[PDB]
Amino acid sequence: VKNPSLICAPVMADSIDKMVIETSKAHELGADLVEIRLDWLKDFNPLEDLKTIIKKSPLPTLFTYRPKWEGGQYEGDENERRDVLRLAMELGADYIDVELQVASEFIKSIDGKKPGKFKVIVSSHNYQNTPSVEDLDGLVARIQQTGADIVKIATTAVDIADVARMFHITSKAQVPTIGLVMGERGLMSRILCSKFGGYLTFGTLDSSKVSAPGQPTIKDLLDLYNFRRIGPDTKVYGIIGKPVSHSKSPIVHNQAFKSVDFNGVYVHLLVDNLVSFLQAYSSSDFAGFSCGIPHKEAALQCCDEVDPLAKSIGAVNTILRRKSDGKLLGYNTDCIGSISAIEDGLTVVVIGAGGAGKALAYGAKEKGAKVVIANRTYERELAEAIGALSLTDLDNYEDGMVLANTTSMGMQPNVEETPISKDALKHYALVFDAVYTPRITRLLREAEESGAITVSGSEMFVRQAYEQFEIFTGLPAPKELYWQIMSKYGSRENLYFQ
Amino acid sequence: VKNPSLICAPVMADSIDKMVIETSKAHELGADLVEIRLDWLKDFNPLEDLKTIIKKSPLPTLFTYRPKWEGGQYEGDENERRDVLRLAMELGADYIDVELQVASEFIKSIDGKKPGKFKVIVSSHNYQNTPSVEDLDGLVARIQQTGADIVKIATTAVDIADVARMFHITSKAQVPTIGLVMGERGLMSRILCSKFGGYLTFGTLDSSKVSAPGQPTIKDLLDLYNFRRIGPDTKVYGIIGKPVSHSKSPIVHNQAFKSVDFNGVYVHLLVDNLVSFLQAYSSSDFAGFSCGIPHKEAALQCCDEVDPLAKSIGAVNTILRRKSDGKLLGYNTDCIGSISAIEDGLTVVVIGAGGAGKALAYGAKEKGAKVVIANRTYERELAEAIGALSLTDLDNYEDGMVLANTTSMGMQPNVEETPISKDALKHYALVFDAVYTPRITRLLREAEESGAITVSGSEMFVRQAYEQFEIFTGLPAPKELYWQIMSKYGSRENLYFQ
Ligand SMILES: O=C(O)[C@]1(O)C[C@@H](O)[C@@H](O)[C@H](O)C1
């Protein structure tokens, strides 16, 4: 429906003076409005304090006095709570949020007494699940019937497939709708509002100031996900994985998209079940995916056509949805990214026998000295398929070898986990770690002080990434750009997007 | 497993000095220990601050430094976070909670370096659902394998039936287990820990200081639910309803149980689906239920035997599980409680045609002047079955009549909702409102200033309640006691138990 989504900053400071500073900070960061969470004030003098906030806020104000029975902090008399909201309205609030449960009564109380600019949000919060389209429709209709100006429905993501139902509601409900899905699995619903008709989304002043599960920062909305550029025609891409919150794929692809003015947006896709995910998001809206752990090997099966190199490897890390058919095309950019990063660093030992191990093993047998496979589960077979070893014995194994970790071992937050004893490392000339979060794993740290050559995950990451760009956009990989983007925007540690 | 459950108070103040005061308050209220949520400190000087807390706390200390990726507030370096926890241990902490994800690494780091009193909790938090017993078992086994001293598993209640699986885990896992289910539908799991083997439960300093959804206060655990009296043999009772959070049935029945030293405990039962609920909790552990809206009429069907008065009414508000069979016996205490309350106040108009309306209508035709039925949906038929009217017309209707609301209209938080216009009230001698939360509804308020006689919900509530006691316990209804209990413990307004 109508306008691009607004960005609202929750203001939850426990004193009036700190709230005022928070509204200023909201203006600074680029928020469009603020939600004043009155129920978070430790001491509250309604007449005096409401007046102060409305006077001093540089942004339009939305007031919320959230009761315990709707997930809030306010306990006490219900009429007094409504008095405050009515007061906010007549003191010049731009919005109040009133709970569906008491909305009929409340809107009756201000009938013919509303100021000209004033809008009433009527909200419903579901902390269990995301109901069927049938039930959401009934919920919209009920909220409309209270006399709401704006409908607000927050649900909870049990699975990422849930978000599609919320998109359908914001997309087609003929009433201004704030429709958001909480939880890490609902994060996509907070980002893509401007594509699917959402009236507003909440972005935090910073990560410590979250008012409901899954909210990103205002800064990430604007600068990372390029919120203002997202529109009805924007194509959606994302990294399919579990976990997913460490991935810097959305950082690099969104910068690149923006840099070449490509109408695409890239998000995190926390996916429990690959098959159900691809079925839930089969529309043209969803144009391509990167595939991470644990879905690489799996994605090879869900693809309708598979690139020879990908079939020869047995794993897909990149999925393109063809405009023509609607059919999924699978590629693998892990192989060349791994090999090229290693060669640039200059028999190879490949840790792990998942999708990345497959790609790195395959490419290693192709380009000179060749390969030993090492994995947790010994059966992972791979070593026979390309010409084995278990990591129980990996410490026990030439003195100028190459080691290549392709597992998640060492990945944040498991920063003291290494796949091999430091003592075994001085028998290696070079060691490659696919893990790029953190940049210096325990493996790479210990390998460096073992005299060996270290090639970090980012060397692999950037290479496989600009190849995914090319697949995604059909535009020549802007390699120099992707290096520049990673350096400038991809260098911070301990980031979780969730 | 082993000891009665401990009561732990979450300490979340954002400064060190305020935390110290909170630990003292915890001691005051009766908590057994405190969980120091280090990730909530705005300014933190680990060495100095840890020392202060450990020195000044009157209670055993559990330290938690919860990262963003596990629902906490801490962002930053992972090794620094672990350093703090290790420091807490060596400064004399009684426990630390370390997240399952990094527990192996962490416990390896303190191997042979743990103080004598010190225990390591290893925790897993599930904000989506409550997994199958199969998956919970695997989760227990994984947590055990890290070298945990104590297993902590928090899940989320999608339905109240979920809690039974958590009870099975705490009951039978041969390792100290903290097993809790979050959300209003999981509240029962926090109360009944001492019956089902739980090592610990969290209770708040007050309702504003909740660290995870559904936690009751320490004061309610101890004084309302009689936490210390709950044991493996305690029989469980509860109010089945939706909503349920307003009910004072747990206040009155737990006082009565305690007063006559009956080994029972009464909780809120937020039930979406009656049939599935009764199936999930069919064991002897669950000995009886009160039935509220919307399950009264329904419960009549789920009962194996039905008391004549209940069959004659068509609704069950009390369910007893017979020790003999295991079979459900249904009774109705609404009829006599409604009628007696009205008579004591001294043609009748009955608002509502649910379970309560049925009982009140039936008893009214039996005892003198007789009855007109009024309901939202006009078809609710009732008026023919006992000898009709819709509330659209109820305002339009002798000058010494009796009005009896038996719906939830006017119930908190809908305090300005009344089922009838004030103008129609001066045509009534007496008006009864089954709603006892709040005590003075809009209906009773306006009726009093309309000159009429007012009989409040509590007159009905207490009467039907001591009759449920008699059914539940087989002990003579201590009527004077129930009046005294309601007066002393049941008088506070705007209480939500959730
Ligand atoms: O975003 C990531 O960290 C990736 O997982 C890196 C590497 O695994 C690629 O093959 C995936 O497509 C994306």
Ligand SMILES: O=C(O)[C@]1(O)C[C@@H](O)[C@@H](O)[C@H](O)C1
């Ligand atoms: O706890 C309540 O408020 C009740 O709902 C009051 C009345 O409805 C009784 O019949 C129920 O058993 C309990």
